[PDB]
Design a protein that fits this description.
monomer; 2 domains; five-stranded antiparallel beta sheet; binds the ligand COC(=O)[C@H](Cc1ccc(O)cc1)NC(=O)c1cc(C(=O)O)c2cc(-c3cccc(Cl)c3)ccc2n1; protein domain specific binding; nucleotide-binding
Length: about 280
């Protein structure tokens, strides 16, 4: 760690503290995560090889004393701050579309490598001046945000799949479009019920096996489903159709990242550059 000079703290929570730092030798500016303390070290060192333009690079893993440091490629801004900055006008559709497309590319890559993110949220999606967007904080190692949690996770499924990331991304897509969180729950049951209130209480018809999930209770209220026209106005039918497929209750029916990339919504995708104030 002596090889790094901390510039300023930029994060704190899930694991440890995050600092913007300079590599005293390479001259590089990086994001340095210091986690307070065998399989882990091995697995993590592995994922280090995983390289894709839409995944934040893990540059170094440094273990010393009862401390573990992860060194990442540095990006100045995240999507949550950009969404907040764009709140008055909203992010232009062509940029929402580019970001969604890129995130699906990153996920398709992770997923083809049997890697699940598990906790996608705007705070952990980093953007740059070139119009790129990247997946960060995979939880490789505060109030927990539940807004983007897939229903199978909330219902106690222990062996959930890559479909959980597609659900999270659908929630983020909707939020970019409407400028409002889709399902802002403040507890696990409130998150669950907010989902049910919008998409309808799931049953065996639309989600075979749902009534047998660990945390499923027959006593859940039975709400009827709303229509997406009310959910994400004024997103076009191509966008709504794709969102509906990313928000299917049944994980096995939920669209994959690879198939989503082929959806008609992306026929006219481009790569616009955002206006960022760093
Ligand atoms: C907004 O704040 C953040 O996003 C913070 C700080 C930050 C802030 C700015 C930055 O530029 C970087 C980090 N991010 C993190 O703490 C953080 C944590 C992990 C992790 O799982 O431990 C992680 C893993 C990969 C990775 C890489 C390759 C393969 C795989 Cl499976 C995973 C890539 C980025 C990651 N970032």
């Amino acid at each position: 760690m002596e090889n790094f000079q901390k510039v300023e703290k930029i994060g704190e929570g899930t694991y440890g503290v995050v600092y913007k730092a300079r590599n005293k030798l390479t001259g590089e500016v990086v994001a340095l995560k210091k986690i307070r303390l065998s399989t882990a070290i091995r697995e993590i060192s592995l994922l280090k090889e995983l390289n894709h333009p839409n995944i934040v690079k893990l540059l170094d893993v440094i273990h010393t004393e009862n401390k573990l440091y992860l060194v990442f490629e540095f990006l100045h801004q995240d999507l949550k701050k950009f969404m907040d900055a764009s709140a008055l006008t909203g992010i232009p559709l062509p940029l929402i579309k580019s970001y969604l497309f890129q995130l699906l590319q990153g996920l398709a890559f992770c997923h083809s490598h049997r890697v699940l993110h598990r906790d996608l949220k705007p705070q952990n999606l980093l953007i740059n001046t070139e119009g790129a967007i990247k997946l960060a904080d995979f939880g490789l190692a505060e109030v927990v945000t539940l807004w983007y949690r897939a229903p199978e996770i909330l219902l106690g499924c222990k062996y959930y799949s890559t479909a959980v990331d597609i659900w999270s991304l659908g929630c983020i897509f909707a939020e970019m479009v409407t400028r409002r969180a889709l399902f802002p729950g403040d507890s696990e049951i409130d998150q669950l019920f907010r989902i049910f209130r919008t998409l309808g209480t799931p049953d065996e018809v639309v989600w075979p096996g749902v009534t047998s999930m660990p945390d499923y209770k027959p006593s859940f209220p039975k709400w009827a489903r709303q229509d997406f026209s009310k959910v994400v106005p004024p997103l076009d039918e191509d966008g709504r159709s794709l969102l509906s497929q990313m928000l299917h209750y049944d994980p096995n029916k939920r669209i994959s990242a690879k198939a989503a990339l082929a959806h008609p919504f992306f026929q006219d995708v481009t790569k616009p550059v955002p206006h960022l104030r760093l």
